[PDB]
Enzyme design. Sequence first.
Site, PDB file in Angstrom:
ATOM      1  NE  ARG A 107     -44.832  73.952  63.053  1.00  0.00           N
ATOM      2  CZ  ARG A 107     -45.600  74.000  62.058  1.00  0.00           C
ATOM      3  NH1 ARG A 107     -46.189  74.986  61.509  1.00  0.00           N
ATOM      4  NH2 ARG A 107     -45.535  72.429  61.537  1.00  0.00           N
ATOM      5  CD  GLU A 138     -45.602  77.840  68.845  1.00  0.00           C
ATOM      6  OE1 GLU A 138     -45.347  77.001  67.901  1.00  0.00           O
ATOM      7  OE2 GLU A 138     -45.281  79.184  68.621  1.00  0.00           O
ATOM      8  CE  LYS A 142     -52.119  79.671  65.501  1.00  0.00           C
ATOM      9  NZ  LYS A 142     -51.005  80.903  65.811  1.00  0.00           N
ATOM     10  CD  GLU A 149     -52.805  69.129  68.388  1.00  0.00           C
ATOM     11  OE1 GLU A 149     -51.789  70.268  68.041  1.00  0.00           O
ATOM     12  OE2 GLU A 149     -52.725  67.968  67.867  1.00  0.00           O
ATOM     13  CG  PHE A 161     -47.688  70.521  67.535  1.00  0.00           C
ATOM     14  CD1 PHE A 161     -47.689  70.347  66.110  1.00  0.00           C
ATOM     15  CD2 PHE A 161     -47.364  71.910  68.211  1.00  0.00           C
ATOM     16  CE1 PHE A 161     -46.679  71.325  65.317  1.00  0.00           C
ATOM     17  CE2 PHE A 161     -46.453  72.813  67.152  1.00  0.00           C
ATOM     18  CZ  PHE A 161     -46.456  72.456  65.930  1.00  0.00           C
TER      19      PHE A 161
HETATM   20  N1  LIG Z   1     -50.836  72.769  68.711  1.00  0.00           N
HETATM   21  C1  LIG Z   1     -50.228  73.282  67.680  1.00  0.00           C
HETATM   22  N2  LIG Z   1     -50.050  72.605  66.320  1.00  0.00           N
HETATM   23  C2  LIG Z   1     -49.516  73.361  65.463  1.00  0.00           C
HETATM   24  N3  LIG Z   1     -49.090  74.413  65.358  1.00  0.00           N
HETATM   25  C3  LIG Z   1     -49.103  75.123  66.443  1.00  0.00           C
HETATM   26  C4  LIG Z   1     -49.909  74.568  67.743  1.00  0.00           C
HETATM   27  N4  LIG Z   1     -49.602  75.566  68.769  1.00  0.00           N
HETATM   28  C5  LIG Z   1     -48.993  76.498  68.262  1.00  0.00           C
HETATM   29  N5  LIG Z   1     -48.686  76.328  66.707  1.00  0.00           N
HETATM   30  C6  LIG Z   1     -48.211  77.552  65.983  1.00  0.00           C
HETATM   31  O1  LIG Z   1     -49.209  77.759  65.181  1.00  0.00           O
HETATM   32  C7  LIG Z   1     -48.850  77.925  63.805  1.00  0.00           C
HETATM   33  C8  LIG Z   1     -49.938  77.441  62.773  1.00  0.00           C
HETATM   34  O2  LIG Z   1     -49.357  77.494  61.488  1.00  0.00           O
HETATM   35  P1  LIG Z   1     -48.925  78.764  60.745  1.00  0.00           P
HETATM   36  O3  LIG Z   1     -50.103  79.753  61.401  1.00  0.00           O
HETATM   37  O4  LIG Z   1     -49.291  78.861  59.193  1.00  0.00           O
HETATM   38  O5  LIG Z   1     -47.550  79.064  60.966  1.00  0.00           O
HETATM   39  C9  LIG Z   1     -47.544  76.756  63.893  1.00  0.00           C
HETATM   40  O6  LIG Z   1     -46.670  77.450  62.550  1.00  0.00           O
HETATM   41  C10 LIG Z   1     -47.030  77.192  65.287  1.00  0.00           C
HETATM   42  O7  LIG Z   1     -46.250  77.933  65.106  1.00  0.00           O
HETATM   43 MG   LIG Z   2     -46.961  82.046  66.725  1.00  0.00          MG
END
Ligand SMILES: Nc1ncnc2c1ncn2[C@@H]1O[C@H](COP(=O)(O)O)[C@@H](O)[C@H]1O
Ligand SMILES: [Mg+2]
Length: 561
Positions: A254, A299, A249, A247, A339
């Site tokens: 979030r 997000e 990112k 997916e 998501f």
């Molecule tokens: N498709 C997505 N699925 C999950 N997290 C996403 C996605 N797009 C953006 N994010 C962000 O990417 C982070 C991934 O986990 P972390 O980096 O541990 O915070 C999430 O906390 C969201 O803020």
């Molecule tokens: Mg971010």
Amino acid sequence: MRYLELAQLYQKLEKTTMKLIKTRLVADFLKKVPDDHLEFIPYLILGEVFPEWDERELGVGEKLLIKAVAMATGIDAKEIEESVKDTGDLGESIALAVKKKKQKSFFSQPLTIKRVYQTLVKVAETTGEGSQDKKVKYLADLFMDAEPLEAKYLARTILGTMRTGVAEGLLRDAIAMAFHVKVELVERAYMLTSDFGYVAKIAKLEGNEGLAKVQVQLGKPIKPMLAQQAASIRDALLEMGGEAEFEIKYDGARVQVHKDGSKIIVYSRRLENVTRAIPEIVEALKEAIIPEKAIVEGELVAIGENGRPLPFQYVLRRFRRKHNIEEMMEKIPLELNLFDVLYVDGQSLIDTKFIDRRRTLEEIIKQNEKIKVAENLITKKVEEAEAFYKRALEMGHEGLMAKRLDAVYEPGNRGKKWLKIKPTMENLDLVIIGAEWGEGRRAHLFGSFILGAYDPETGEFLEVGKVGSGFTDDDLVEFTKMLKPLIIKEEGKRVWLQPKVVIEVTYQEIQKSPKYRSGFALRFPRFVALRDDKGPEDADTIERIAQLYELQEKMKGKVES
Ligand SMILES: Nc1ncnc2c1ncn2[C@@H]1O[C@H](COP(=O)(O)O)[C@@H](O)[C@H]1O
Ligand SMILES: [Mg+2]
């Protein structure tokens, strides 16, 4: 139970620096709390009235508090103010006012924890017309019957300045200790509901079996599942077993959405109820989410006039509501890319494999201008995911997320079931635990900030670096104004700060320094942004840093050929 017993607990807690002693004190107290106080007692023990995700707040400032105490004690507000000049602490001065009140109204009707709690709740819910006067009266009613010791803690509780060294980690341990339940189950239940009161109640009445049965509760936020970083799409697919959900990112903030009928609550990453900041998104969600009840997350991204994503800072701006939501909805349009779905119509999907949750997400969301479902690709072909990755970057996004198809949702866990794939080492979100005044013409501003990584088990923030680059003069001005109130110790150019502000920083390298207690040191960090969608306790941990360090070293170890 008398509020005096709770005040006595606060006092004992302040008289020890030992986490184990504090845990014991809290556990012993929890054991004595009447069953019907359990749902809120943990917060009161932390010196809070409500969980951080509540939205309710006592709209009481120092002045209003003093006014209420003056009213309750017969002592002039000015006198209370003058007392603070000699005491250096409003709580202590309020205790004095209450102590002096004895001269004109000697007998108190002993405060019960119930009365204090119910009063504080009423105060927070009093926002109507003359809310301020009503709040003063409710508080005055309470301080009229307070003993000095109680008044000091009631005051700090109202102001949010309680200094008991009790953190979530210790409270979790205390609950486990008090009710002879497994700390892992207390934690599991807490990750699912973010509600220590709820968890404590179940722990006491149902023990381990009850805690093991805890399921997400609509309206109570679920701690978000986190992700580790993979070196590449190829590495992510390998870790996934050869197939994975990919997916985009999205670069925004979030959020987690709870829907019950037409009622919507949106929580930010730190579980702040930010529903009020995004009215247009809430309206869009009422329409986009088909089922009556649901919990989904996504997000939230700011969209520019050219349709491309705007910096994520714009989304955090929306959350702070510093400008009227009216003007900002115009100036900062948003889109929510969902998501995950964690609950639908009374059914928790936490223990449901990801592929089923995604299929459900696609089924339950009628996408509209504002609410979208994260674009995906399920593949076993590295080249396909790489093409998707390339596109995600050209689209202005961060890269891709890779998610194991059969994985359950793991609240609060930063495992490998979700992986992030980016073109650069991810920035660290750390707590500003200190600062140093600048030099020369910058002597009046903080010019450097000491960063700490959070330690859940201990509750402290361990130094991992010092950042003094990347801040514009205005940033320094703003951080200085923002942090000055948090100074708890000053020494020359160095100031120690209450660990509350989380900022995102880049770093040239993560070094494994024998030097600091944390074992790590960031080489030349640079300020990226204020990350106030993250609480101190949501900041990156030493483990997270160790993980990036390993990734960094893995790449250095591959250098050349
Ligand atoms: N498709 C997505 N699925 C999950 N997290 C996403 C996605 N797009 C953006 N994010 C962000 O990417 C982070 C991934 O986990 P972390 O980096 O541990 O915070 C999430 O906390 C969201 O803020
Ligand atoms: Mg971010």
